[PDB]
Amino acid sequence: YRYTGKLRPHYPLMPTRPVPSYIQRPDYADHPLGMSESEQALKGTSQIKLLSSEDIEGMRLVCRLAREVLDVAAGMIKPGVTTEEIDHAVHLACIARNCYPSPLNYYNFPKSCCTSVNEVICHGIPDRRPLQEGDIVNVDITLYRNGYHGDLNETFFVGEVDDGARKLVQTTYECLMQAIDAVKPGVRYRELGNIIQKHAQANGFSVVRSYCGHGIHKLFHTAPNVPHYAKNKAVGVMKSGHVFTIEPMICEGGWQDETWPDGWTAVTRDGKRSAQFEHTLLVTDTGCEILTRRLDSARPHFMS
Ligand SMILES: [Cl-]
Ligand SMILES: [Co+2]
Ligand SMILES: [Co+2]
Ligand SMILES: [Co+2]
Ligand SMILES: [K+]
């Protein structure tokens, strides 16, 4: 394999971390390939669930707990901490909240969160590499509680970073929030990528095409598929009671991706940096509820 940048995996990985049996588990947790037969039953369907009041309460709860776990990870970012150490803290924080860490064993993913440094677009595997001053790192969290999943991610700075890192991370966050500001009943899901790409391109960046936002509720990933690029062909119109994520990945160079031999780590083919932010959103009768928002502070961590 020819690496695309400076990063390499730092092996061995710790043996997989057990989740105590008193924590309720999603179907894939005990499937030997980590397949989710509930998701597979709906593959290629574009119908979108209208959540009940009971489902809305379930999603509000799990999303608030997921935000608490991301904030634990944010407090750990500093030069010299490994991504496996971050993951270990996340794993324990999920269990302390009586939640299952949804990434764990999802299609055999080996860890409890994804850690994506520099040229990693998404799905980086926590490993033995210490974070380095000047890095950018995304942590992507999802929790499962009482049958519901809640999903969010943020990019962080490691120590002092260069101006290009500042600009990339700021622009990516603005792309997410411009999309969110457009969510309300009657808006087509395909419009969100028109908004995201306009802002990225105005600042000299590109938009990843291979990975999209998604429906999330009783399933981790389901309809709607929510692309982040312009002129896409996503199916569907927003209605009050829909729940889904917006999770744009923006790049310094070109948008093309490739996957490492581990089958998960997605990297820019040119080796230049990428950043991402994500919320889980509920459409309301007039707009949206940001289920994974911070309740206690005005800004994402990189601004704080
Ligand atoms: Cl995801
Ligand atoms: Co993912
Ligand atoms: Co996520
Ligand atoms: Co997501
Ligand atoms: K990254």
UniProtKB/Swiss-Prot annotation:
Q: Which GO terms describe its biological process?
A: platelet aggregation; protein maturation; proteolysis; regulation of translation
Q: Which cofactor does it need?
A: Zn(2+); Co(2+); Mn(2+); Fe(2+)
Query: Looking at its record, which EC class is this enzyme?
Result: hydrolase
Cofactor remark: Binds 2 divalent metal cations per subunit. Has a high-affinity and a low affinity metal-binding site. The true nature of the physiological cofactor is under debate. The enzyme is active with zinc, cobalt, manganese or divalent iron ions. Has high activity with zinc; zinc cofactor is transferred into the active site region by the ZNG1 zinc chaperone.
According to the UniProt record, one GO cellular component term is: cytosol
Localisation: Cytoplasm
The positions annotated for binding Zn(2+) 3 are: 140, 151, 278
Keyword RNA-binding: yes or no?
no
User: Which GO molecular function terms does the record list?
Assistant: aminopeptidase activity; initiator methionyl aminopeptidase activity; metalloaminopeptidase activity; metalloexopeptidase activity; zinc ion binding
Covalent S-S links between cysteines: none
Q: Tell me which residues bind Zn(2+) 4.
A: 151, 214, 247, 278
Q: Report keywords, A-Z.
A: Acetylation, Aminopeptidase, Cytoplasm, Hydrolase, Metal-binding, Protease, Zinc, Zinc-finger
Which spans are transmembrane here?
Answer: none
Identify the residues that bind a protein: 123, 221
- From the UniProt record, list the reaction(s) this protein catalyses: Release of N-terminal amino acids, preferentially methionine, from peptides and arylamides
Q: What is its EC number?
A: 3.4.11.18
The protein's job, in short, is: Cotranslationally removes the N-terminal methionine from nascent proteins. The N-terminal methionine is often cleaved when the second residue in the primary sequence is small and uncharged (Met-Ala-, Cys, Gly, Pro, Ser, Thr, or Val). Required for normal progression through the cell cycle.
Family classification: Belongs to the peptidase M24A family. Methionine aminopeptidase type 1 subfamily.
Subunit text: Associates with the 60S ribosomal subunit of the 80S translational complex.
Protein name, entry field: Methionine aminopeptidase 1
| Species lineage | Eukaryota, Metazoa, Chordata, Craniata, Vertebrata
Q: Which gene encodes it?
A: METAP1
Shown stretch of the complete protein: 81 to 384 of 386
